[PDB]
Amino acid sequence: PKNFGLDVKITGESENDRDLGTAPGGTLNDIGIDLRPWAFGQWGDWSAYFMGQAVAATDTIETDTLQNDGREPDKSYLAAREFWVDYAGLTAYPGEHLRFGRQRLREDSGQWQDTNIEALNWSFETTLLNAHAGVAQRFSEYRTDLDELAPEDKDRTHVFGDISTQWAPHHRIGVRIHHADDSGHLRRPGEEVDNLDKTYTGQLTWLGIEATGDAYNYRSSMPLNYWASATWLTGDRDNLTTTTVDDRRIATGKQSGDVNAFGVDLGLRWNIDEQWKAGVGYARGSGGGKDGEEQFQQTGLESNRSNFTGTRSRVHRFGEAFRGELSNLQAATLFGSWQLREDYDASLVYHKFWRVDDDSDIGTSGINAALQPGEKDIGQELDLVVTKYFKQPSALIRFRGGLFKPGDAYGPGTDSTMHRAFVDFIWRF
Ligand SMILES: CCCCCCC/C=C\CCCCCC(=O)OC[C@H](O)CO
Ligand SMILES: CCCCCCC/C=C\CCCCCC(=O)OC[C@H](O)CO
Ligand SMILES: CCCCCCCCCCCC[N+](C)(C)[O-]
Ligand SMILES: [Cu+2]
């Protein structure tokens, strides 16, 4: 058991243009280094881990796919990524352990949780039955450049769980729950409201079923793989109301409404042979409705990145460029993928996006530009991921790129094309 190491990453990012040319900046053409020293110890059923991070870049690029004066990042910073203790001795099951601290929370779809966060998480993974249960909350960014949490994350508590069984070899059915609460943390009327304050609070519960047949298993022995999930979002959100007096904003009350939304994601992958795969996907997050109540949203812990193309490399489920969130969004996707032993892989993904309700914004982490009322046609995207794995979890060099072609929903004076591309070189010592 290796007690220390150092992960070294060099990243280049090209982005143009996040705002489709409508606002200033929003593009990237830059390079950076990301150094992650780590430490690990193990003593019987216990273990503990720390990973820190030092980054220096020519601009504020994304070196980690998992991510106000207080919220402007610096080109360079130090951070604590993970720090936890783990106990695996409750049961003899090796996939069963309890982890406490800032840790990687992930499920295979990436659509519920895929992030580093302070948490207490119990995992129970066996051949016939998988289960998890945990609680999480952000208390800090643990970063030298960020002094404060984003208001949405502040005092927001997450509680979640899942259970599933393998009813035949490689065919799984399960349910999953997540609840996020930050209710009652709004400014009471009379108080001054800063840029650091919340504009809303919520109590939200996601309830999902999910069936998978080696959905995210790149080494599947089956000729066909699939995923299917349906997720119900319910609860309510209180919207903070304000007024401005003498150049100072101030709380006046709140406006409340129920949330009642629904999301679905379906996919089918043909394992043509040991190297070639192809597939189709469909996903939809409901949108709009009375006071946004039919507006699906995700937990806020998601990456939407997964091995859905059937390779070791994870790919953004809704485009490297568009980076859609499943929110008032319909997407149809087509992909093919290729790999050669453990040395290389590659994926080509096409997406088409539509709005569900043409008078509501969509779910997006990649494009910052206003939509035209009454237009459903968000656009199309083509993505390519290519990776080489070196002999010395493994060193790699990877290209990740997305080309997005905005549809009629973005309208006049917007660029006809936008891209976001990365090259990452990663070496482990
Ligand atoms: C269904 C689309 C799958 C992706 C197709 C586009 C792939 C584009 C470039 C792949 C480049 C991979 C190069 C791997 C390589 O250099 O192999 C060297 C020898 O051929 C084997 O060692
Ligand atoms: C500025 C570097 C940009 C790199 C972009 C990511 C490319 C990722 C994989 C492409 C691999 C192409 C070269 C493959 C290679 O090095 O072959 C070496 C083998 O020993 C030949 O069999
Ligand atoms: C080289 C290992 C890096 C570990 C150091 C991580 C420190 C980041 C947290 C310190 C607090 C930063 N803050 C909140 C004051 O801005
Ligand atoms: Cu711009």
Ligand SMILES: [Cu+2]
């Ligand atoms: Cu098997």
Ligand SMILES: [Mg+2]
């Ligand atoms: Mg155990």
